[PDB]
Amino acid sequence: AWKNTEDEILKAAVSKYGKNQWARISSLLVRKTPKQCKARWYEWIDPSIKKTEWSREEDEKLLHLAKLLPTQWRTIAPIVGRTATQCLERYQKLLDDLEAKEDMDEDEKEMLSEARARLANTQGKKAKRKDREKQLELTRRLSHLQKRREL
């Protein structure tokens, strides 16, 4: 499916962790799996992809490599530059046709709040348990010092 809600946490996720980790992200997405979470990134979401526009004169050489290789579509992508081999296959599927003719709302809001907790705090178990020890010791004194004034 892949709706907007998904992608806007994913973009925030990669900024957080790094594109190397993927199963940390697919936990926070719930219904997505680190293969899809990674896969769907290299096709679409990232900045390096060129979503918009396709410039005719640069494009008549993109259908030229198909004459050379025939299939082989992943070696074509780094040359053609537009990448996202899906669209590089779909673009040559445009021009070859023309030549011849002539709960769910609620569950989305839950994951969107859980993600705001993950991004917010990095302290870990040791930070939380060490501060409680300070909080106990400080709170212990305030009762202990009142005993001294009482006496």
């Binding site: 293969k35 990674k38 896969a39 299939t71 579509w73 992943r74 081999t85 899906q86 296959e89």
Partner: protein, 48 residues
């Protein structure tokens, strides 16, 4: 099927496969239809 009958534990992708496996058993002609379509059109495949 051979792959997973032996193994005591199963993993995500295996869990995923067995459903698609079991779904195919139930109704073949619908799965046949999808196989033929997969050949004709598709040329780019997921990371192996």
């Amino acid at each position: 099927k051979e792959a997973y009958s032996v193994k005591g534990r199963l993993n995500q992708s295996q869990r995923e496969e067995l459903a698609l496996v079991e779904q195919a058993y139930d109704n073949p002609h619908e799965m046949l239809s999808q196989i033929k379509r997969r050949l004709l059109t598709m040329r780019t495949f997921k990371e192996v």
